[PDB]
Amino acid sequence: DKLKEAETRAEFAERSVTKLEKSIDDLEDELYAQKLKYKAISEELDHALNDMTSI
């Protein structure tokens, strides 16, 4: 009875964590790719102004 409830609850519990794990790692990778994009865009005109610093 309640045993069956426990089995069902535990079995469904494992479902949510594992599926979310892949999404979490994909989010991390996409975040890092975008941050690298911005950093690459950041330093270029930064150095351009460094050259343009007082001409």
Partner 1 sequence: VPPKIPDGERVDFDDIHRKRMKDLNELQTLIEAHFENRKKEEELVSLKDRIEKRRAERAEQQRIRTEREKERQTR
Partner 2 sequence: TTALVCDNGSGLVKAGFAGDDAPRAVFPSIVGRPRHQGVMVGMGQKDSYVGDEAQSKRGILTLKYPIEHGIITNWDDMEKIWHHTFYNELRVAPEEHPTLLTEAPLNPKANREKMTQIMFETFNVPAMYVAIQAVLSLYASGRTTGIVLDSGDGVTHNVPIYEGYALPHAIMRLDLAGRDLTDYLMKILTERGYSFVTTAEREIVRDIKEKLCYVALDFENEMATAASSSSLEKSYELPDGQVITIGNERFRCPETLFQPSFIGMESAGIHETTYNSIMKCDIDIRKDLYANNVLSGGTTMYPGIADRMQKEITALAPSTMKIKIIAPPERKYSVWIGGSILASLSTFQQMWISKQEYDEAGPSIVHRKCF
On the 0-12 / 13-18 / 19+ scale of CB atoms within 10 A, 20 is exposed
Q: Which does 51 bind (CB under 5 to 8 A by kind): partner 2, partner 1, a copy of itself, none?
A: partner 2
CB nearer partner 1, residue 8 or residue 31 = 31
* H helix or E strand, kind and range, residue 55: none
Work out the number of other CB atoms within 10 angstroms of the CB of residue 9: 9
Which residues sit at the interface with a copy of itself, rule CB under 8 A? 2-3, 6-7, 9-10, 12-14, 16-17, 20-21, 23-24, 27-28, 30-31, 34-35, 37-38, 41-42, 45
